[model samples]
Each structure stands twice: as C-alpha cells, then as structure tokens.
Target: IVGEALEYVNIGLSHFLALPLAQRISLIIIIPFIYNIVWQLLYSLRKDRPPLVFYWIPWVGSAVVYGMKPYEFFEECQKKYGDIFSFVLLGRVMTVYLGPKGHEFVFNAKLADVSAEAAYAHLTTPVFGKGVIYDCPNSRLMEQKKFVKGALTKEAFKSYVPLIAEEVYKYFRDSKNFRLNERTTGTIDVMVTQPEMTIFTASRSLLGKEMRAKLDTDFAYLYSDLDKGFTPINFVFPNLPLEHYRKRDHAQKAISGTYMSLIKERRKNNDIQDRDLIDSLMKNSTYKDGVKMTDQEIANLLIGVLMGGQHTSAATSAWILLHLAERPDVQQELYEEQMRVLDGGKKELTYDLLQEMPLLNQTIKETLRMHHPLHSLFRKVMKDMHVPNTSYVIPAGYHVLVSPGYTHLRDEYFPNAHQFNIHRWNNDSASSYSVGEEVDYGFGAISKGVSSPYLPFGGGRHRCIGEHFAYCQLGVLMSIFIRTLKWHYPEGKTVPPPDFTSMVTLPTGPAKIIWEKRNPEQKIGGR
Candidate 1:
C-alpha cells in the first residue's frame, strides 16, 4: 500500500518510502504542504487572470486544507490575492469574490450566466430523489419553492408552533441524552440533544404526524446515513467506493419508499389537507408548465426540505443555547422579553407572539451573524461573467463562490463582529449599515437584492424557501428551553471551538451544558 500510494507522490515518495516510519510520516506531511504552495506559485503567473496559487497535485489541490477550514483558507487567499481570488479544487477552478460586492455579483447573476442546478446536482440529485431541487428546470424549482412557501404562511405557522412545542417536550422526555437523567439539575450534551430535538420538531411541524411518529424511533439513523453523504468529499466525488456512499444510496431509496407509501395511502383515502407540507404539496404542486411533479419527486422534495432544516436549525439552536448559558445577562433579558410577550399571564404561543419578542430574535440574529450554517455558497458559471468594476471575467466552466458569513464577521458591517453582542441588533446604528435595497422574487416577499451583506438566509433566486419556518422552529425551541431551564457549562469547562469538518459548523468536542429548572416560587419584575 505504501509503495502504491508513493507511486503518485513522485520521486521523493520512493526516497521517503525507503526511510524510517517517522521520516516517512514527516515526508508525507511536508510533500502535500509544499505541493499546495508550489501549485499556488505556478498558477499565480498568469498575466491577464485573477491571481491564484496553483494546486500542485491535479484534482486534489487545496482540498484537504480548504475542506478542513474553508474560511481560514479563504482568508489566506484573500490576504495574498486581495478580495478577488481563485483556487483549484478537485480540478475545477473556483473564483471567490469576498464581501458585499461579491455577494451581489454571484447571487444576482442572470440565470443564463450562472447555474445553481449544475453546481448542486452532482451531490444533491442522488439523495434528494430525481426531479426536485437541483435536478429540475429552474422554473420548476421556483414553482416548487412557491408551493412550499404557501405552506409556511402565518396560518400554517400558527398550527405548527403548538405541534413543534409538543415534539420538543416529547423528545427531551424520550431521548436518553436529556430526560433519562431526571433530576432537579443535570448535564446534557447539547450537540446530541439539539440535533434530535430539531429533527423531531421539524418533521413533526413540517412533514405531519406520520413523519413525527417515525422520528420517535431509530429511523433517525436513516436520516443520518443520508446526511453523511452530504459532506465535502461527495461534493467532489458523489459516489466513491465507500460504505457511507452505499448506505447513503440505501437510505435514499428506503426513505423515498417510506414517503411514497405514505403518500399512496393518503391518496387512496383522499385525506390531504392544509395540515402539513405533504398535504400542501399534494394538493397544489401543479406546475404552470402544464407538467405535474410525480409522487416520487414529491417524496424527494420532502426529504430535501426537511433535511435543509435539520442541520441549520440544529446548529443554530445549539450555538445560541451555549452562548446564553455562558452569558446569564442575555438569558435574563431573553426571559424578560418572553415575559413581556406573555404579559405575566399564561397563554398559548403563536407566530404573531414570537415576532414581538425582539431581544430573543436579536440573540438569534447575533448567533447567525457569528455562525451561519453554510460558510460558502456556490454557482457554476454558464457564461463568462464579468466582475463588476473590474476587467476580470470568470470563464464559463469555472465556479463562483460567495460568503454571506464573510460580511457577517467583517468589523465594517458588524461592529465588533466577532463578539456576541445581542444588543448590537437592537440599536438604530445597525440600520445605517445597509448597502443595497431589497427586491421581490415573486414567489415570496424576498431578498436583500443579492448583495446585502447581512443575508443570514442567503439571497436571490437560490435563497432558502423555508426561512420563516426555520425561524419559527428555532424560536419556539429556544423559547421553551430558556423559559423552562437555566443552563451553563459545567465547572472548569470552556466552550469548544468550531468543528469545520462536518457539513455544518459544529462544536469540536461534546457540547455539554448543565441546567436547572426555573423555580416556580421565583418572580421577575414583581410578577
């Protein structure tokens, strides 16, 4: 195996294979590090092109470093090549334009000029089933998004809040990660609990009771198998000779069958209604093109939409819960905000009510600012798209990358951008930072017009369809969590760093937080 691996490592590989184990290990590390830098140097010599340090090894250029920590890799390239730069990843040239202007350039590029479908299809098509998301025509996706958006309106959300709340309670009680401990105070790993809680609540609220029942069992492993397939390696190589790839395939077919069978049963009974996404889609998924989505496509779309929420909502809830635990001041303000919304009286929660809790929403906004689930967004160029105010034109075959989180952390847009300051969003000063105006996308009231630096939900045609739904689910989970329990890191434990290896931004270690149920005798603000 060593000799075979060394075959690709070049002349030094043999010299290295001839050496001791320690020496061979060092050579292995040094070769790749130097190879990446060497390629970068060789590639930077192009006279009329954007500067990029070439990746020395074909198809593996900058992959390990970039995959491990993309933001850091971006920063290094930006520092050396200015805001606009290029890098080779998996044999494709990806041009990254940093900051607000970059966001507009890529997000607002004419659909004729850039293609989200082409860029995402290799990875998403297999798992999300066949004719949805990146697999269909852009117009079809727009209509699908509109149909899904119809199910997330105010009336729909009002029905969902209670269902999501109930699911959260059931999850905590059932998941051995939390409720099994059963004490006045206990420690729980938030990373594990938050994912379980998010999937349960999202499936319950969005997919309906039938889906929720499945989330109550080991069926979550099917979702996990599907999720493991969504990593960076799959972005470059969707199906490799690997166990996870096989499992991902198996999970995709199994889950699609499960959804289709349920859909078939409901169709036989004519039981569809406005109660959930399944009902909404089943009733209204007719396309303006005189074509209708097949039932299999509907099932795939369901998986796509629900999985979209799983990671983003799960990561957001866990991060904010940890931040609030670290800062008691914010938690008290959050609790008080809820109290104000509730008016010192017990009442049912609703979509309208959550919107009134400004501080709670601000904390969420701050969390997303520091840690947006997706660090980079991509669009493959279909035409030679010219960079605004510059002579640089990305070739038609290359990809363009934009980072909403880039501006999210820039001190210019977000003062003290790296720090957690919930009140930063409460000030009028925050409003003065707007760079561009909003535009309508026609499906839903949408957009910061592609260039807005503060797009936590993305921008343009590819903007997330379930933004309001995510906010509702996350808000309800946080509301229940904060109102019921006070939590902090166990003694002598510091917050863990981000684990950028996964598809989402996750904590590097066990995300543990200790909690105590709020005292029933305690009163706040003379309540």
Candidate 2:
C-alpha cells in the first residue's frame, strides 16, 4: 500500500507538467492561491486576534493601495473592518487603529510591549545618526526630549520671538519671492516663500545669528542634503541603496560635521549666550541613564531639532497661509487680532502678546487640526501584545500604526469634520473640539491627552517637543504675513488637495497668493 501511494504521488506531478503551457501555468499558479486560502483560514481560525486580512501576493502585499492613498484606503478598510483591523504592507503586518480609541491604545501602549525604536530606527537612525532619537532606547529618547525641552523655555521665547521677526522681515525684504522694493503689491508664492522663510527664521532663532549667516551659503548646501534624508520613502526603506544613498549620508554627515565645528567654536568662544539649541543642550542635556551626550551627539540633536521644526512648520505655514488667503475675511480677523493684541500697533509684537491673541492661536490650532503633519505614527510589537479590553492578541514582530489625523477627520468625532473652520476651536464653539470620554494620555498632553480626537502634536512620552516652537514661529510668521500684507487667493483657484506623498501632509500642488507688502487693513482691532 505504501509503494502504491508513493508511485501515485510521483505520477501526479508529471501529469501536471504534461499539460499544455496555459494549463501547466494554471496548475503552478493554483499552488499559491491554495496556500493563501489555507493561510487565510488559519489566520481567521484564531479566536485570539482582531480582524485581519491575509494578502495574496508574495511581498507586494497592500503596498500600492495602502501607499498611494492611505486615507481613502483606510476609509475603505474601516467600512469593512470597523476601525480596528490589520493588513499586510510590504512584507509586514500593519495593524491600524483608526479613531480615538485606537489612538489611545497605540500611543499609550506600555513601552515594554511596543518598541518605537524597533519601528523607526530603520528609518530615523541614518538621518539623525547614532545615540539620538529613535536610534537609541525609548528611555534615552524620553531623556532626549526632556533635554531638548529646556531650550523651549519662555525666557528663550522672549528673545527668540523678535529675532524671528527680524529674520522674517529681512527675508520678505530680500528674498526673490518678494521681488520688489516699496511695500509693493504682487503675488507671493507661499510654497516658494514659506519654505525659505521658515528655514531662515527657525535657524536664526534656534541655531543662532552667526551660524544662521552660514546657512545662506556653504551650510545651505549641507542642510539641503540632510533635508532630502526626511523624504517619505525613508519611512520604511530608510536606506534605499543607490548612487542616491551616498549623497544623502554625505549631506547628513556634512551637516553633522558643521554643527560639531560650530560646537567646538562655541566652546572656544567661552562667552556663551543662552540662545539656540546648542547652548541649551551644552548646558543641560544629560540622559537619565547617567549617559551624557557628546558634542557630536549635541550636533546631531541640533540637526534633528532644527529639521524636525522646519519640516512640520513649513507644511503648516503653507496650509494656514493658503486657507487665510482664500478667505480675506479670515485674514482681516487675523490682522485685527494682531492689531488688538499689539494694542492697535501700540505694543510692539512680543511673545506674550502673541500668546494673548486668541484668534491667532485658534487659527494655528485649526490648521494643525485640518492638516496634521503626519498621517500615521508607528511602533513595533516586541512581545505578544493584547489589544486593551479585548480578547484579541497581536503576536510579536507585527507593527502597530496609530493615526491622530485619521481620528481628526472622522465625522463621528466632529460635525462637518472636513470643513476648515477656525471657529470650531473658538470659545463660543469650544465644546465642538470635544468628542467623548477623555484621558490624560501623559505629561500635559493636548486635547485631554492622547485619547482626545484632536491630537495635532500627539501625546504620551513620544509627543512632539516642537509644538510650542511651531505655535510661536508660525504665530510670528502669521503675524508678520498678515501685518505686512492683506492678501487674497490667486484668482479662480481653490486651495490644493493634500499631496500625502511628502514626509508630512503638504499642499504639495500649486498654492499661490496675490500679495502686497505689509499694509494695515482699512480697520482692525475692533475699532
């Protein structure tokens, strides 16, 4: 009987091979389909998991669908899978939690069970370098954030705000985007103007004055290289080897080296000022694990701090500028808000004044709400992770994706959720920003913490260190732009759709504004 069974099995494959080419190929193809079917059954058989779909293709998985248009893909999945589900993407399982509940789960997951370094190191390590950020342990990252947080103090803000004002004023006076003298009326390409304007202002305020001067020339070239390091592709294939890879690292190293040289010089100077991240890090940056960061580490952190600020703020400023441009009414309100807080241009613009301006703060808050910097935040499961309050368990090595932006856009959370209404954040409409039950999420977290549906700056230990800086810088930029010019949208245009392909959410397509150099509105400040 055993001999007969062996002979029969050997004969079956030969018969399959003997068929016509189409039939033979069909037989070959059936193997994968059959295996995938079996895999799906096995995956579904587990009573210990949430909704998950097995992919049919080998490694291609859901790359095209999930990569090209993630929000729409997520919407479709949510319809079928109900907000919490897992799908395969590029050889990894990415379990996404769509709304606030999911956001709370992943963002607040115990660091022991979920490792951010495991998820992001493959992407950030090369760009940011060793011993900093996601390249190091989470405890180290927590310490790094604290060390960096010292730089964002209000005393620093007091000095930095005017320095930013000076930088932005000079750029508007000088950059080709402004293109003429005499407070003249013309078009200001925000996409053209803001990125350059953002870097100059941020560099002057964070990197320092003399170092900022270098940015206009040789250092400009160095930063542009590292700038390329933060592209969307780096999120996964952090090292996409090409003649391309060499240039990126060369830029990262060159920029890192420049910061180190600047560090050496700052030490050499001896008369230090408590301005810029280098000064703050040099004075106060020590990891809780008793590890002190080296000058090289400080330099690299400066790159991280500087680039992190620029990347998010650049995208945000463009979004806010365009939105305001479309509504001259909003621009007028912003202008009036500035004028009112400046005591009708009586008080010179100050950080304290900017803070007191509710409408300006509301505008920045709304822009972040409507156009969040990142669509998704990630963590890798380091152990068997059970979904909280559920029977579902995620086995180790799968990835977890949490998207505040996803929750932000949901109608269940916000009525007319797609509209860009700054009023939603206003005091009269204050209740609109709240949804359901809220939680502390972590240290002074936003919108009632990570569980809040409105997390533009994220929450928990990994919450962004750059939030206050963005508000201040963009608040300054907004004041500068609105005060300097009352502009309108370029004729016959709507604000462009989000080009989600970039490192952050950006109005990546054509977004231009008709402009004039800083001129007061006919009436502002409620008088």
Candidate 3:
C-alpha cells in the first residue's frame, strides 16, 4: 500500500510539472492557496491551545489592541497564558516574552541570529531605504553605532555643551520679545512652539555650526514626517501606497538631495573642519571600510539623529519644565543645584560640574522612568530559542517585544511606582527599591541601584547612540531654564498623561506653560 501511494504521488507531481506555462503558473498559485487552507485548518484545530489567543475582531483585532494600549494588550496575554503568549499581529504570528527571563533571552541574544533588523524590516526599510538599515550584514549596523557612538564621547560632548548652552540662551533671548511683558509679567508658551530652536541647538552641537545652520530649517520638517510616518499599518503593508507613503518619500528625497549637495560641496573644499557629525562622517575612513557612506546613507543617519534628538529631547525638556512648574519643591531643589554649581564663578557649567549635580541627574532619571519615550523594544527571534528556565520553545521568525513602560511601572521593581519621586535616587533609605540579583531590563549600571526598570534609550548593543548626548541636552536645557525662566502650567490646567498613538509617545495636547524670565542676580532659594 505504501509503495502504491508513493507511485501515485510521483505520478501526480510529474503530471503537474508537465503542464504548459499558463497551467503551471495557475498550479503554483493554487498550491499556496491549498497549503494556506490546510495550515489554517491545523491552526484552527489548535486554536484553544495555550499561548495563542484569537480575538473577536475581523482582520484588525491584534492591530487595534496593540494600537490602543500595547502594554495592556501584553498584560491581557500574560493573564490568560502566563509569560509566553502568541498572537497574530501585522499578519504574522508574534510571541511576546514577558518579564525578566524573557527580556534577557531576547535582548542579550546574538544580534545576527536574533535579528532586530528582520523583525522591524517592514517599518525601517520603507523609511531608511534598503541597505541603509537591514540590507547589509553584521558589522554595518555595529559600524554605524560605533561611528555615532564616538561622536558622543566625553571630550566630544564637552565640545558641544557650550554650543547647546549658547543656543538655549539665544532662544530665551529671542523668546523674550514675544512675551506679554518682556521686562517682567510676560509668560512664554512652549506648546506648538518653535521646535526649530531645539533642533538647531542639537544640530549645531551634533553636526556643528555651518552644517546645522544650513540644514536646521529644512531637515526639521522632513525628519518629523519620516518619524511620524511609522505606524502599525506600515508594518503590515510597508509597500502599500498610502498618504504617508508620499510624505515619507518626499522627506527622503528632500533630505537626501540636500545632504548630497552639502557632501559634494565639502568634498570640493580640500580644507575640512571636523566640527560636526557630517564632517566627522566625511573624514572618518574606517566608518565604511573602503566604501564611504553614500549621500543617502548620510542623509538617513542625519534624519535618524534628528528624529532621535529632537522629539525625545524636546518632550523631555518640556516634561521637566512641566513637572517643575507643578512641583515647587523640586523646582527649588533644581534651582539651588544650579546656583551652587555656578556660585561666584564666571565659568560656565562644564561636564564635570554637571555630573556633580546629583539632584539634577536624579530628576532626569526619575522623569525618564515616569515617562520613557519608547513604549516597547521591538525584536525578532531568529532561532528556536528555549525560554530561560521554562519548558516552552519560542519558534524562529516570531516578533518579540520587551516593554519598558510596563516593566518600569511594575510595583515589585519600583515601589509606589506611580508617584513622581525625584528623591528616590537621593534617599539612602530607598535602598529597597534598588535592583538586587534579579535581571534588569537594560537601564544599565546606574539603573541597577534604583531597580533599573526604565529603558528610555533602549539597551544592549543597539542602545541609542545619543544616550549621553540626550542627558547633556536635557541637563543643559534644565539648567538654563531653571536659571533663566520662572514657569508654570497655565492656571487651572492639569498635565495630561502621554498619548501613545505613535512610536514615540508625547503629551496629548499643547503643553501650554506660562513663563517669565528670572532676574540674573536674584538667587533662586531652597536647598
């Protein structure tokens, strides 16, 4: 009977292969259709199994859930099937590994094997273009990271600090003219305000003066469109023609064209100044092996930095002011820190000085924990990996996400996690809040002591290259604003929770704050 069946299958395939081109094409199409039917039938049979939950919506259940509240969606799965749960999202079966062990498995796994590039290929490729992000092999992303990382060193950061400070002062000075009372009673609003000033500051510091001044205005809008264009829909139908498709395409063209022109101009001028990131990229021979980065790659990297720097830093700076405006005590503490550092000295706040300001650092960390920019870290499993200390095996090609937002708020990791306590870092009695032998989800060494729950800048090898740059920008913004502006949220207004509709979350509406310039000589009181 077995021999007869084998002979029948061979004959069937032979007959199928013997068909004409048209018939063969039709047969090929039908094969996948038949295969899908069989696969769906098998899946339906196992529908009630653990770790796989099918929602009641048609073609949009998982997308809707993830779109609405990604953290809550993960929580629902955890409640139903425990740590490891599988669901269909963006037309693929994704397994979300929750908590420490799961996070460890995904983040610490080999980059080549685990494959974030493949996992997020849909979203990134459309924006960054092929070969810019996932198209190249191992060392490409690492090289990009290293090149950008070198620009964030202590010495490099120190060089940028004064430029950032100067830009802040420049904004404040220009902003005074728009105030109700330029001399005293006027309030400066930041909502729907000029992101250009912030962008220019970052660009000047990161890219240097000439490049920043040149690209600041145009790059800002282009970067915004590109960043905002990333959505759940993009992941599902990356190549599908959509409105944002046009916008992102336009942005890519505008940025690419502009950067290439600038690069060519720089090449023509034999005298090169290593002032900014562009110049650095142009000069560094090792960044791209023998083949230097093309203008498109340079443009994409610029957009990446702008997107990373502008939105997060702007949101963070805005949040810090909002929090301080609400909490007078914290504001007072920050004020004192600023005054003490600059006491009787003509010298500006240097890198060493900024580091010594413990309260300021703590405030930034606390704010990050309270409101991390990225809701979750998206990664893909490339191997049939076993869950650490568990019986389950995570199949290869599954999309896995590690959520810092939910993890940061876990009561076990952060006691009274909802409270905005800046003193959490300073108070020695808060030792219980510190992380013990338990696994930490990528906040790094400083976070280890404070339970290290937040991953605002991501972690591991793919951690945000601008981590230090972000801190410096925030620190400078906070320091300067504390010294220069006396601010508050509009009367009777309450600060709203962030709107997480997009990739990087921000305050829902316009952050309308009333600001008045502080007297240069007047000392802000309270230690």
Candidate 4:
C-alpha cells in the first residue's frame, strides 16, 4: 500500500511538471484561490466568531480596499454585517466595532484582555526608540504619560501662549511664504507652512530655546526624516531595506543623540528647572515600582512626546487654515471675535484672552470633528473576549479595531455632519456633548468611558494629554494670524478633500491660500 501511494504521487507530480508554463502558473493562482474560498467557508461555519468580510486573495486580503478609504469601507461593511465584522488586513485579522458602543468596547476594554503595546510596539519602537511610548509595559507607559502631563500645567500654558505667539510672528517675518516686509499679497500652501510653524512653536514652548534654535539649522532635516517613518507602509513593515527606512534609522539615532547631549549638559550645569519638558521629565520620571528612568530613556521620551504633538497639531493647524480660507465670512467672524475679545486689538494676547474667543475655539473644535488625525485605533486581544449583548467572540491573538473618527462624521450625531459649521457646538441641543464620568489612568482625570461620539482626542487610558496644549497653541497661532492677515482660497479651489493615504487625515495636496497682510507696513508678530 505504501509503494502504491508513493508511485501514484510521483506520477501526479510528473504530470503536473510536464504541463505548459502558462498552465502551471494558472494552477498556482487557481489553487490558492480555491483554498482561500474553502477557508472562508470553514471560517463562516463557526458560530462563535464575528462575521468575516470575504476576499478572493488569502494573505493580501482587503488591504487595498480598506487602506484607500477606510470610512467608506467601514460604512459598507457595517451595512452588510452590522456593527461587528472581521476582515483580513495583510495577514492579521482585524475585528472592527463601529459607533459609540464600539468605542466603549475597544477603548474601555480591560488591559489584561487587550494590549495596545502588543499591537503598536513594532511600529512605534523603531521610531520613538527603546523603553518609551509603546515599547514598554502598560504600567510604565501610564507613569510616563503622568510625568509628561505634569509639565503641561496652567503656569506652563500661560508662558507657552506668548512663546507660541512669538514663534508664529517670527515665522512670518523670516519664512519666504509670508515675508511681511517684502510682499503684501502672496499665495501660500498651508501644508508647508503649518507643519513648520507647529514644530517651531512646539520646540520653543516645550523643548526650550536651545532646541528651537537647532530647528533653524540643518538639524530640522532630521525631524523630516523621522516624520517620514510614520507613513502607513511603515506600520505594516517596520523594518525594510528601503531608502526611507535607512533615513528613519539614521534620524532616530541622530535626534536621540542630540537630546542626550542636552540632558548631559543640563545635568553637568545642575540647571534642571520647571522650565520645559526636559526638566520636568528629569525631575519626575521615577516609576512607582522603585525603578528609575535612565538619562537615555528620558531623551527617548522627549522624542515620543514631541513627535506625537507634531503630527496631530500640525495636521490640525493646516486644516484650520484651509477651512478658514474657504469661508472668508468665517474669517471675518473670527477677526471680529478677536477684536471684541482683545479690546479692539490693543490688549495683548494671553492664555486667558484666548478663552474669551468662543467662536475661534469652536472653529478648532469643528475642524477636529471634520478631520480626525488618526483614522483608526487598534489593540491586540490577549484573551478570548465575548462581545456584550451579542454572540460574537473575538479570539485571543487577533486585533480589535475601533473608529470614533467614523462616528464623528455621521449625520445622526451632528445634523448635516459633512457641513463645516462651527456654530453647531454653541447650541446645546445640536449634539450630545456629555462629559460622562471621569477616571485617572495615572496620567490625569479623563472621561472614564467613551460615551461621546465626538472623541477627536480619543479616550480611556491612551487619551491625549495634549488637548489643553493644542487648544492653547492653536488658539494663539490663529488669533495672531486673524489679527494680522486676511486670506482666501485661490481661484477654483474650495477646501480640498481629505487625503487618507497617510497615517493622519490631511487635506489633499496644494492646500493653497491667497493672503494679503491686514496691514503690510505694521509689524503683526513679536511681543
């Protein structure tokens, strides 16, 4: 029987090899196609599993469709399969939960059952360096976030407003885009301007004067390379032998080394003060477990914190400018709001005065609603979890994905959600803007649950600590711009549609605006 079996196998192999090359290739494709279909059929028979979104290809499943337009894909899948469904994304299975309930399910999931670090470590560790951000255990991460949050205090914010305002002023003076002295009218791209301004201001306010100075030199290029490491492709393939990967590796070390030098110098001088993030971290980065962070870890944490703000704030600032350009009426309204709040443009801009400009703050809120920086948030399931009020079971080792960003765009949540209306936030009845319960997850007291649909800063343990800072930074940046310049979209351009190709949601390319200084000869920047 064994001899007969071997003889039959050999005969089959010989016949297969003898077929034409075209036929052989066809068989190769056909075999996998058949196998994938059979596998899907097998997976569908399981009663406990969430419904799987079918695809013809096996390993490279649903990547192109999902990657290109995630919201559209999510909407279609939700309609067909309800709120919970699983789809293969480049080999890993992703179980997606849509709407507010989904947000609560994923964001508020117990840490023992779901791990954000397991899902993100490979993607973030290489960029942010070791022992920081997602590279560490969850408890350590919580403590680190607390240390950073300590730096972003009310006193620090008051100091930051003027520093941020000064950077905005200086940028317009020196940058070729504005050249306050040289040109009265100019065309500028917010994409180029906002990112630079975001870094300059953040560095000045957060990292202190020395780091901000380094940005004026070629050291700034290192940040560009580091930023390149955050593309969607890098999330899938963390280490590749490609040019961007090489540059990313080089920039991470070079930038980290620069930070360490500063740390060493500050220590030698014994000049640690509550002035910026470095001092804050150096003084308070001790973990409760009796483990202290090394100088190198402090340096890495700075990179992680700064990079986090740089991406989201930069994208937001750009969107704010783009939308303002589209609605000159809104710009006029913002300008008028500033005039009324700032004692007719005579009173100095301060953190307190920014609070008085309700419309301006509301505009920032509206922009975030329209364009959430991160499209999807994910966590790896560590234990088999049962969905509440449903029969679905997400097995251990698979990933659970949630998108509050999707909920932010639904008409049911906000009337005519696609429309850019800043005033909607003013009316209490327009939306459900609840602040639910609060819980401190080591960092600070944030809303304990993800009950609200408008969660741009996210929620639960990983909620952004930069919310107040962003509002402060953006409020100052826009207030100064409103007082100084008036801009509009270039001909044939409304606000551009979002480009989802990146890890952040950004307005599509050539996000250009035409500007004329509110008063060309008068200096609009500096204290």
Best by TM-score: 4
Q: Rank by lDDT, descending?
A: 4, 1, 2, 3
- CA lDDT of every candidate: 0.81, 0.78, 0.68, 0.89
lDDT per residue for candidate 2 within 1-527, as digits (tens), equals: 99999998889868866889997788678887788768877888777877776567855677787766888989988988787888887778888988888877888788788988887776777887788887776777777777777888888888889999888777766677764354377776677677888899898988887779887787687677777777767766677668566777898788788888878887899846687888888888766557789987887778787888887899899999888877888888888887778877777888888778788888888888788889889889988987777778888989999998877788888788888888877773221243444543222323444677888877766777777788889988888788778778766987888878777888866688888756533222210
Model 3, range 1-527, lDDT digits (tens) per residue? Answer: 89999999999989888999998998777776666556555765553332666654333437777777777788788877787777766566677766665556556666555777776767766776656555565567777666666567788778888888887666555554333233554554453543555676887887667666665355567767776566656666676577778888777777667777777788898646767777777775354457777767876776665665777777776667667778878888888878888883355888777877778878888877777877767777777776655666667777677766677676777789878888877852121232554332222233222223556665555656677788888888788877776777777986666777765667767767776666644333321
User: What lDDT would candidate 3 get against the real structure?
Assistant: 0.68
TM per candidate comes to 0.88, 0.90, 0.81, 0.95
| Candidate 2 off by > 4 Å | 6-30, 53-56, 180-183, 428-449, 518-527
The prediction achieving the highest lDDT against the true structure is 4
Tens digits of per-residue lDDT for model 1, 1-527? 89876777796656657898997888778887787677667756654468875565756667788778888888788888789988878878888989988887888888899999988888788778889989988988888888898888889988999898887666655556555235457788888888888888888888889988886578768999998887767687788888989999899999988899989999999988788899988988898867888999999999988887788888888889878878998889888878878876386677788888777778888888888888888999999877777777788999999888878988888888878998887742121133566565547655456666788877788888777787788888888877878888888886677788777787766879998877544322210
Q: Give the TM-score comparing model 4 with the true structure, all chains together.
A: 0.95
In model 2, the Cα lDDT at residue 162 comes to 93
Error of 1 at 368 (Å): 0.4
> After superposition on all CA atoms, what RMSD does each candidate show versus the true structure?
7.0, 4.4, 7.0, 2.4
Evaluate model 1: give its lDDT.
0.81
**Local error of candidate 2 at residue 410 (angstroms):** 1.8
